[PDB]
Amino acid sequence: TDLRTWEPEDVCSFLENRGFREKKVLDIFRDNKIAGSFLPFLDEDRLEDLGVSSLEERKKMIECIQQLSQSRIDLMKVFNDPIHGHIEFHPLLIRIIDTPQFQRLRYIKQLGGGYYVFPGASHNRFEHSLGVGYLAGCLVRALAEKQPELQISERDILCVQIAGLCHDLGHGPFSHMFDGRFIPRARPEKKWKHEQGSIEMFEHLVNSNELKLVMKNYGLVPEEDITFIKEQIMGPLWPYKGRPATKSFLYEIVSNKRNGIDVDKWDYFARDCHHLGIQNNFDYKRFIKFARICEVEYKVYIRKVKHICSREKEVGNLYDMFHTRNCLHRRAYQHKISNLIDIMITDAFLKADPYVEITGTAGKKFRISTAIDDMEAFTKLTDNIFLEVLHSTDPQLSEAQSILRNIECRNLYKYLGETQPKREKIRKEEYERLPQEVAKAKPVELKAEDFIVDVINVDRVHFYEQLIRVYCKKKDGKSLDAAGKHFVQWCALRDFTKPQ
Ligand SMILES: Nc1nc2c(ncn2[C@H]2C[C@H](O)[C@@H](COP(=O)(O)OP(=O)(O)OP(=O)(O)O)O2)c(=O)[nH]1
Ligand SMILES: [Mg+2]
């Protein structure tokens, strides 16, 4: 048979009939519910920690496990990715992957409104998350072997991979629109980051599916390692609790907001380049091979830390990466129409928010805007909500539908143009005023609602602006002229660049 089929007692019988007949050791296996599937992932040290103090018995135990048909490599699962080719995942990762909480990422478009501008961009967070997991695994492995002095363990590697998988667990419908346009607009009081949702949903994931025990049986320590995983996704003497300062570099792998060089970016750069039809000058495989940990000292008392570093002559590689970063940002991410569509979807959601019910834990009803407060509600919240509204028979959503029908018939707000501030910038508070200002600025009645102003912010490593787009909702010719010249005058008044 397979070990996969084996209950814990089956493993106990196997162990007995293979010579280990001492009830204490069998009790170990019954107690931790070590079903067969775990066996090929057991260590001498794991057997030590579980509590067999027979320095030779552990060896013979593992020998028995080695003799078996099915090995470690025989219980990996191989995904076929067009970005990364084939991809092996350790079974725990699969257990995490195969949950409602995670599978939900199949139904959230990576580029959100993007798909409605770039028909190639049909890809969702699911496959990108897989990719990030895999890449995380690659870099941590490479550093582990090249420098075994680092004491990087299997455990660490799995935690890094899991952090990888789950960095985007907490995105809402249409990805960045939800956490960047809708929630801030619907819950201005609340500060919310998709990462917050990510760690909350991971906590939910492991608990709804009782993977806490499973993690233990694969050699993780849930209490420590879950905090490690969470910390990697979220962020912050030594602030982190998940790992000692001696293992600091691990935190630079999955999310590195400092210098913007991490495996999340690598995957979605490559992937988005793949689907948009853009050629990506950056070979990450070259990066990982020439990646080494080495110590850095900055004097503030001098501080000494272990950062991830790359050979100095692989600086051209980074020039290639940052071009691609800019290339994507310029052409695709801050695309004037994509963002228009995100704005319209948000606008619809806002008008649908009051009436759409989404049940969470104990069946408490939540609104689209508040589902983020209950993971068991948020688990149900996906892009599909777009179509649910659009197709609803509830007549309270007529307002919301009509906006979505306009998206369908390509009847979008008309784009008056872009502008730049010559100096200074616009206070995050000052935003709500802007549609008023444009409306009120005279060169026809034009309400402040008839305008949207879209403010956009354009935005180290170690070796060994503001854009304003104005859209007008009213789509008739005369109002369009009036609005255009309103915008021009508003630009002139604030001493802004001559519109596009
Ligand atoms: N488990 C899983 N596999 C997926 C998913 N998406 C694509 N795949 C691919 C990867 C697998 O290599 C392929 C087959 O996996 P399955 O567990 O469904 O069946 P398989 O034929 O590998 O039998 P096995 O479980 O290895 O005995 O499906 C997913 O969300 N979950
Ligand atoms: Mg990502």
Residue numbers in the entry: 72 to 307, 316 to 379, 385 to 527, 533 to 548, 559 to 563, 589 to 624
Which of the paper's sentences describe this entry?
The SAM domain is not required for dNTP hydrolysis and viral restriction by hSAMHD1, but is essential for these activities of mSAMHD1. To better understand the regulatory role of the SAM domain, we crystallized full-length mSAMHD1 in three different states (0, 1, and 2 allosteric nucleotides bound).
The 1-Allo crystal was crystallized with dGTP-α-S in the crystallization mixture and diffracted to 3.4 Å resolution. The No-Allo and 1-Allo mSAMHD1 structures also crystallized as tetramers in different space groups (C2 and P21212) with 4 or 2 copies of mSAMHD1 in the asymmetric unit, respectively. However, this symmetry is broken in the 1-Allo tetramer, which is a dimer of dimers, with only one overall twofold axis. Our No-Allo and 1-Allo structures show that these inactive tetramer intermediates are composed of two relatively rigid dimers with loose tetramer interfaces. Although mSAMHD1 is capable of forming tetramers without nucleotides bound to Allo-site 2, these states are inactive and likely represent activation intermediates of the enzyme. Starting from the most open No-Allo state, dimer A′ swings progressively toward dimer A via the 1-Allo-state to close the tetramer interface in the 2-Allo state. These tetramers likely represent activation intermediates similar to our 1-Allo structure, and they are not fully active states of the enzyme.
